[PDB]
Design a protein around this ligand. Sequence first.
Ligand SMILES: [Zn+2]
Lengths: 97, 76, 142, 137, 38, 57
Amino acid sequence: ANFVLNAQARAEDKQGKGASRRLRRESLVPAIIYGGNAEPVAVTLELRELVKALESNVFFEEVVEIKVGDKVENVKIQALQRHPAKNTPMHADFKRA
Amino acid sequence: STKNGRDSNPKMLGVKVYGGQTVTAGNIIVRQRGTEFHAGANVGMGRDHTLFATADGVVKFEVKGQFGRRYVKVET
Amino acid sequence: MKTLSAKPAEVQHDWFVVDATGKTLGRLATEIARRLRGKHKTSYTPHVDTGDYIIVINAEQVQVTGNKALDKKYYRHTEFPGGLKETNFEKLVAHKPEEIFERAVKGMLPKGPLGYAMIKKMKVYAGSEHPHAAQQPQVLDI
Amino acid sequence: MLQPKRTKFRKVHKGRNTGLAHRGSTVSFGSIAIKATERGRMTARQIEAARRTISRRIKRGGKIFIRVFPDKPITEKPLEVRMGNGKGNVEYWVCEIKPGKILYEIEGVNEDLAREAFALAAAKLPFKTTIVTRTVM
Amino acid sequence: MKVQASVKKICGSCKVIRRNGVIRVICSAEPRHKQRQG
Amino acid sequence: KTIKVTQTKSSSHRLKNHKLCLQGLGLRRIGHTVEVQDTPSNRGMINKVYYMVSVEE
RNA sequence: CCCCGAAAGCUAUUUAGGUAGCGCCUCGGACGAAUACCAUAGGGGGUAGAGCACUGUUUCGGCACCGAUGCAAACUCCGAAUACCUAUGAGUACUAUCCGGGAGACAGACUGCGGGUGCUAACGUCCGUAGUCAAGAGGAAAACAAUCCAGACCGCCAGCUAAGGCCCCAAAAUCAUAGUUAAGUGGGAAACGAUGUGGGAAGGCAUAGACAGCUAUAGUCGAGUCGGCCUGCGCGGAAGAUGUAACGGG
Ligand SMILES: [Zn+2]
């Protein structure tokens, strides 16, 4: 409700090292959604939106809505990877809740 | 002056026959300082822990037993 | 031997007059060198001078861009020890305008007896008048 | 001057310094820290000088955590000695620095004071640094 | 005049200016604060 | 069912196995074109030296 | 005149610039698919990376142990890509192997990658691996064995391209579209310093009136303004000896 992330699908041709580097050059972020009773889904987000969401403390405890097209998932942030020297986010895990 | 500068001649240890190859009786399979591999069916062990074949057949490697030892055997 | 060379006895040199007011030095010198060497004629031959005569008037109105008026340096060396002399574009253009054109075109012509012969066909005059009315030069806008 | 109390071997190979600092790039003791953004070497004298500057600036009002330790010995030839004749003698100790390595952390001090102290310390170091603070993840 | 590689403002009456491609610091209160980068 | 392969660069300074791949395809000089059966064994040699050949189907 | 075509390695040597056997060249005979390239299938590993389970070493808490946190050529609970061995198979290729006659060579060099040594110095030195020179001409890099492109049987005043290029010296675009630079930066150099100029993401204040100036928080004044964060290109830091001399020149 308070936090909505707009995402696109990440198909198999957009996975791997080269594809992820191309995405990050395009200034997007790959992410994975897993959790009980369903099959994991791979998505992509916007760096500015992710940074803005992480700027607030309450984001790490609330349930957020990730919307890709018509469907919508209610998740919580589970893990996060950062660049060691620049601190820019590089990947994200979301657990279904 | 230095106090180092010594070494010993090479000893040429290692696997001589790999899995899936055919052997005749007497062929040496593994040269090893200790028992890194153990003798299975149709394989004998020498006094310096060398593994050799005692029958004609095909070499096979596996992991077996309660201690997880590596075994080599010959299938006829 | 079907490809023929031009014969010097049949070469015909025409006379042209060019006004240098407001032109850029190098972009004028390239065209002058082309027409002095004769690259614009279909009888062009590397070992024969087939070019035209070029008169240049209003030589002190030539221009350079950027800060080159203060910064572009002209050097020469008398062969005595320590004898390096230096000047710049503003002083040189107010003093001897012909030297600027001579240096610029000399740099772009070939370095040999034929090049010495080809540079002799360029006449540079400071003012708006030239003494070659007897040759009836034509106006060339380059 | 920091130095190992004991070592297994006196002299070590030169090696190569490649890669990033995936370990030791997260604030774990204090609230604010300084981390290197460029790779290089850090000597014991440099560590001591930076620590002294930071402590003097912060007036011993908080705790300072040092997260780099020099454990690699470096040798040098005696001087006016020709090539050969064995490896040289140990002269000083260094710590290898990869981008992302956190050098110092401060606990219990105001942020402006900590930034002033870190700015003073950075002028003593042979590589570029940056300032980071604690985050949830 | 102080001629140095690093030129900074010392007090509040100092001013950083650029003249003919050179960075200078001029102070209204203290003449000993005059600096030029070089 | 059949592939046309043309050699586009020199093979004088390449690796030994790469030269052997060219010779095993049958190419002999720059600009040479050959026609070969479409089998995985042949596509292996083609993919090994992709950088100096042009392939048409 | 025609054909082929090396090596500067290993082992030993009162041996180290000599020699001998093997490796590498050539000629004759035997014998042909037993050979190689690639694709499938089978196999062992302890390197790169990583980690702290052993051996050492490190920091901060608690009571030799516990909790967080680092490091290792001679540490390992782990662990690739390549390389290597074997079997089957398509296509392409004068391939492998054996028996004999004749040798030369056993001073190597640079470049890239993995390293020891040195100062992460040297056109330094010692190994592994690939290319070139040696024993190789032509075009490009101004000139320039070892870099880039490319392997010269002979002749032609024919055509297409590679690397590299298309203002003049000097062959080919003063070609087209959209931006950046003002330093001749381009066409030598760092920590560091700074209202130089583009681009991007935020934040604070603001026409019930913001910043600066002004008149003793009021008050004239009428729109934007304030301070940081990423990022492109520029500026200073920048002193040498015969002559511009750190775009080959114009
Ligand atoms: Zn002042």
